Amino acid sequence: GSHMIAPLSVKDNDKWVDTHVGKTTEIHLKGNPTTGYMWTRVGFVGKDVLSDEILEVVCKYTPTPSSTPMVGVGGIYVVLVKPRKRGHHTLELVYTRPFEGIKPENERYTLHLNVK
């Protein structure tokens, strides 16, 4: 109860909703790995695995090259959130710079899932 996240009205992310078990929720997020930030799970930015025991977040950061050339190693962010347990789970996906660090001024994408 100290200093909230304060959701901006210029960006809609955190999906406050329910779900089922192991309901593999695939999310093909777009962006640009060559911009500076990254679309992964907060607190795991840089690690090998984002998930743990709660949400089987099988995410794969694919920076596939351009169409024909190779001057663009930018792809997407494939996130597979499989509710391992039943209860209050959430996919904390944030837009941070693995090179620098994570900050509040960064984008958000918390796919909330009140796994029944």
PDB file of C-alpha atoms in Angstrom:
ATOM      1  CA  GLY A   1       0.000   0.000   0.000  1.00  0.00           C
ATOM      2  CA  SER A   2       2.719   2.462  -0.981  1.00  0.00           C
ATOM      3  CA  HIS A   3       2.820   4.244  -4.345  1.00  0.00           C
ATOM      4  CA  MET A   4       0.625   2.412  -6.854  1.00  0.00           C
ATOM      5  CA  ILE A   5       1.589   1.603 -10.444  1.00  0.00           C
ATOM      6  CA  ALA A   6      -0.788   4.296 -11.704  1.00  0.00           C
ATOM      7  CA  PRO A   7      -2.220   2.956 -15.011  1.00  0.00           C
ATOM      8  CA  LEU A   8      -1.899   5.523 -17.801  1.00  0.00           C
ATOM      9  CA  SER A   9      -4.897   6.204 -20.046  1.00  0.00           C
ATOM     10  CA  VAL A  10      -2.578   6.204 -23.063  1.00  0.00           C
ATOM     11  CA  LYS A  11      -1.802   2.494 -22.878  1.00  0.00           C
ATOM     12  CA  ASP A  12      -3.969  -0.537 -22.188  1.00  0.00           C
ATOM     13  CA  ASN A  13      -2.203  -3.717 -21.106  1.00  0.00           C
ATOM     14  CA  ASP A  14      -2.979  -5.562 -17.875  1.00  0.00           C
ATOM     15  CA  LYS A  15      -5.763  -7.924 -18.888  1.00  0.00           C
ATOM     16  CA  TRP A  16      -7.719  -8.479 -15.682  1.00  0.00           C
ATOM     17  CA  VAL A  17      -9.651 -11.680 -16.408  1.00  0.00           C
ATOM     18  CA  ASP A  18     -10.167 -15.334 -15.500  1.00  0.00           C
ATOM     19  CA  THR A  19      -9.038 -18.559 -17.199  1.00  0.00           C
ATOM     20  CA  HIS A  20      -8.660 -22.347 -17.072  1.00  0.00           C
ATOM     21  CA  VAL A  21      -5.776 -24.736 -16.349  1.00  0.00           C
ATOM     22  CA  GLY A  22      -2.845 -25.047 -18.735  1.00  0.00           C
ATOM     23  CA  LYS A  23      -4.865 -23.001 -21.204  1.00  0.00           C
ATOM     24  CA  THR A  24      -1.844 -22.280 -23.387  1.00  0.00           C
ATOM     25  CA  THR A  25      -2.401 -18.610 -24.163  1.00  0.00           C
ATOM     26  CA  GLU A  26      -0.262 -17.794 -27.173  1.00  0.00           C
ATOM     27  CA  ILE A  27       0.585 -14.141 -27.659  1.00  0.00           C
ATOM     28  CA  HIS A  28       2.485 -12.985 -30.725  1.00  0.00           C
ATOM     29  CA  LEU A  29       3.671  -9.542 -29.676  1.00  0.00           C
ATOM     30  CA  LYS A  30       5.376  -7.216 -32.123  1.00  0.00           C
ATOM     31  CA  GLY A  31       8.134  -4.698 -31.563  1.00  0.00           C
ATOM     32  CA  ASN A  32      11.773  -4.239 -32.543  1.00  0.00           C
ATOM     33  CA  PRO A  33      14.653  -6.014 -30.705  1.00  0.00           C
ATOM     34  CA  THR A  34      16.879  -3.335 -32.247  1.00  0.00           C
ATOM     35  CA  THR A  35      15.089  -0.500 -30.438  1.00  0.00           C
ATOM     36  CA  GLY A  36      16.477  -0.934 -26.936  1.00  0.00           C
ATOM     37  CA  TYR A  37      13.685  -2.493 -24.883  1.00  0.00           C
ATOM     38  CA  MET A  38      12.376  -6.049 -24.734  1.00  0.00           C
ATOM     39  CA  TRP A  39       9.026  -7.744 -24.309  1.00  0.00           C
ATOM     40  CA  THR A  40       9.445 -10.377 -21.613  1.00  0.00           C
ATOM     41  CA  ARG A  41       8.364 -11.166 -18.037  1.00  0.00           C
ATOM     42  CA  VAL A  42       9.463  -8.636 -15.417  1.00  0.00           C
ATOM     43  CA  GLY A  43      11.956  -9.999 -12.906  1.00  0.00           C
ATOM     44  CA  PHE A  44      13.103 -12.461 -15.550  1.00  0.00           C
ATOM     45  CA  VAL A  45      14.397  -9.952 -18.075  1.00  0.00           C
ATOM     46  CA  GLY A  46      17.651 -11.530 -19.213  1.00  0.00           C
ATOM     47  CA  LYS A  47      17.093 -14.939 -17.644  1.00  0.00           C
ATOM     48  CA  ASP A  48      16.548 -18.129 -19.638  1.00  0.00           C
ATOM     49  CA  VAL A  49      13.101 -18.956 -18.265  1.00  0.00           C
ATOM     50  CA  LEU A  50      10.427 -16.486 -17.224  1.00  0.00           C
ATOM     51  CA  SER A  51       7.899 -18.962 -15.841  1.00  0.00           C
ATOM     52  CA  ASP A  52       8.445 -20.854 -12.578  1.00  0.00           C
ATOM     53  CA  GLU A  53       5.748 -22.871 -10.821  1.00  0.00           C
ATOM     54  CA  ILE A  54       2.606 -20.736 -11.027  1.00  0.00           C
ATOM     55  CA  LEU A  55       2.242 -19.892 -14.711  1.00  0.00           C
ATOM     56  CA  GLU A  56       4.055 -22.154 -17.177  1.00  0.00           C
ATOM     57  CA  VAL A  57       5.011 -19.163 -19.293  1.00  0.00           C
ATOM     58  CA  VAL A  58       6.753 -20.899 -22.164  1.00  0.00           C
ATOM     59  CA  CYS A  59       7.960 -17.784 -23.922  1.00  0.00           C
ATOM     60  CA  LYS A  60      10.362 -17.653 -26.840  1.00  0.00           C
ATOM     61  CA  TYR A  61      11.930 -14.395 -27.950  1.00  0.00           C
ATOM     62  CA  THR A  62      12.297 -14.766 -31.715  1.00  0.00           C
ATOM     63  CA  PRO A  63      14.359 -12.007 -33.391  1.00  0.00           C
ATOM     64  CA  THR A  64      13.992 -13.477 -36.888  1.00  0.00           C
ATOM     65  CA  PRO A  65      15.916 -11.511 -39.581  1.00  0.00           C
ATOM     66  CA  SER A  66      14.336  -9.358 -42.286  1.00  0.00           C
ATOM     67  CA  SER A  67      12.480 -10.698 -45.325  1.00  0.00           C
ATOM     68  CA  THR A  68      15.343 -11.184 -47.787  1.00  0.00           C
ATOM     69  CA  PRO A  69      18.294  -9.221 -46.266  1.00  0.00           C
ATOM     70  CA  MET A  70      19.762  -9.578 -42.775  1.00  0.00           C
ATOM     71  CA  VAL A  71      19.995  -5.943 -41.708  1.00  0.00           C
ATOM     72  CA  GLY A  72      17.084  -6.477 -39.347  1.00  0.00           C
ATOM     73  CA  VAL A  73      17.252  -9.162 -36.665  1.00  0.00           C
ATOM     74  CA  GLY A  74      13.799  -8.204 -35.415  1.00  0.00           C
ATOM     75  CA  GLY A  75      10.967 -10.647 -34.828  1.00  0.00           C
ATOM     76  CA  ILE A  76       8.311 -10.962 -32.143  1.00  0.00           C
ATOM     77  CA  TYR A  77       7.623 -12.294 -28.663  1.00  0.00           C
ATOM     78  CA  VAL A  78       5.820 -15.650 -28.498  1.00  0.00           C
ATOM     79  CA  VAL A  79       4.439 -16.080 -24.992  1.00  0.00           C
ATOM     80  CA  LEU A  80       2.685 -19.306 -23.970  1.00  0.00           C
ATOM     81  CA  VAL A  81       1.074 -18.902 -20.569  1.00  0.00           C
ATOM     82  CA  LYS A  82      -0.043 -22.283 -19.242  1.00  0.00           C
ATOM     83  CA  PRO A  83      -1.781 -21.999 -15.822  1.00  0.00           C
ATOM     84  CA  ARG A  84       0.151 -24.613 -13.846  1.00  0.00           C
ATOM     85  CA  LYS A  85      -1.918 -24.083 -10.697  1.00  0.00           C
ATOM     86  CA  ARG A  86      -5.462 -22.931  -9.932  1.00  0.00           C
ATOM     87  CA  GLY A  87      -6.045 -19.532  -8.354  1.00  0.00           C
ATOM     88  CA  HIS A  88      -4.874 -15.963  -8.886  1.00  0.00           C
ATOM     89  CA  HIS A  89      -2.234 -16.059 -11.622  1.00  0.00           C
ATOM     90  CA  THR A  90      -0.879 -13.342 -13.915  1.00  0.00           C
ATOM     91  CA  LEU A  91       1.539 -12.915 -16.816  1.00  0.00           C
ATOM     92  CA  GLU A  92       3.733  -9.970 -15.899  1.00  0.00           C
ATOM     93  CA  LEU A  93       5.050  -8.880 -19.293  1.00  0.00           C
ATOM     94  CA  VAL A  94       6.950  -5.601 -19.371  1.00  0.00           C
ATOM     95  CA  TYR A  95       8.854  -3.567 -21.972  1.00  0.00           C
ATOM     96  CA  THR A  96      12.338  -3.103 -20.488  1.00  0.00           C
ATOM     97  CA  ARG A  97      15.930  -2.704 -21.667  1.00  0.00           C
ATOM     98  CA  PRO A  98      17.818  -5.904 -20.651  1.00  0.00           C
ATOM     99  CA  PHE A  99      20.977  -3.920 -21.341  1.00  0.00           C
ATOM    100  CA  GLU A 100      20.108  -1.097 -18.933  1.00  0.00           C
ATOM    101  CA  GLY A 101      17.309  -2.243 -16.649  1.00  0.00           C
ATOM    102  CA  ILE A 102      13.610  -2.170 -15.901  1.00  0.00           C
ATOM    103  CA  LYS A 103      11.752   0.998 -14.943  1.00  0.00           C
ATOM    104  CA  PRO A 104       8.150   2.130 -14.199  1.00  0.00           C
ATOM    105  CA  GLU A 105       8.126   4.502 -17.175  1.00  0.00           C
ATOM    106  CA  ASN A 106       8.267   1.321 -19.265  1.00  0.00           C
ATOM    107  CA  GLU A 107       5.310  -0.228 -21.079  1.00  0.00           C
ATOM    108  CA  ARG A 108       3.211  -2.970 -19.486  1.00  0.00           C
ATOM    109  CA  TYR A 109       1.311  -6.138 -20.427  1.00  0.00           C
ATOM    110  CA  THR A 110       0.120  -8.035 -17.364  1.00  0.00           C
ATOM    111  CA  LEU A 111      -2.230 -10.728 -18.657  1.00  0.00           C
ATOM    112  CA  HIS A 112      -4.160 -11.338 -15.445  1.00  0.00           C
ATOM    113  CA  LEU A 113      -5.829 -14.728 -15.157  1.00  0.00           C
ATOM    114  CA  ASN A 114      -8.006 -15.661 -12.183  1.00  0.00           C
ATOM    115  CA  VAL A 115      -7.495 -19.346 -12.938  1.00  0.00           C
ATOM    116  CA  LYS A 116     -10.601 -21.140 -11.676  1.00  0.00           C
TER     117      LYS A 116
END
